[PDB]
Amino acid sequence: GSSGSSGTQEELLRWCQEQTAGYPGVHVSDLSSSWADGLALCALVYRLQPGLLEPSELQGLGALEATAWALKVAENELGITPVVSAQAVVAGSDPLGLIAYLSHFHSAFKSGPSSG
């Protein structure tokens, strides 16, 4: 039951919500600061692929320490080149880059109606 306008960020956000949801503590409510923490990206990645290692350290790592991994396992496994600097994401300087960065994840791990 996942379908709507498949056009606005809503399609991505919601999609990411269901993913991160699983991860305890990670609650994506807005693509502004909800992803700044760092775990967010970590959850989205770890979840997307339950086969990849688990966050044994990320559990108690620094807001940045986390994002670091995500961008890694994402650029290695997922292959989603890091369009934004782990710092920019967490620091919260380039809110645009992040959006584009995530867009890649979905664009690859998306499904449903193309033109609503």
Question: What does this protein look like?
Answer:
With 116 residues, the protein is mostly helical. It has one domain: Actin-binding Protein, T-fimbrin, domain 1, CATH 1.10.418.10. The chain has five helices and no strands. Helix 2 runs parallel beside helix 3. The two termini are 14 Å apart. It is classed as signaling protein.
Pick out its properties.
monomer; 116 residues; mainly alpha; Actin-binding Protein, T-fimbrin, domain 1; 5 helices; 0% strand; signaling protein; CH domain; mical; nedd9; structural genomics
Summarize the structure.
This protein is mostly helical and 116 residues long. It has helices spanning 9-22, 39-48, 63-78, 86-92, 95-108. Residues 8-110 form the Calponin-homology (CH) domain.
The level of helicity is 40-55%
Q: What is the succession of H and E elements?
A: HHHHH
Distinct helical segment count: 5
The quaternary organization reads as: monomer
User: What's the main sheet like?
Assistant: none
Distance between the termini: 14 Å
Strand content: under 5%
Shape: globular
Helix-strand layout with pairing:
Layout (H helix, E strand, L loop, with lengths): L8 H14 L16 H10 L14 H16 L7 H7 L2 H14 L8
Helix pairs in contact: 1-2, 1-5, 2-3, 3-4
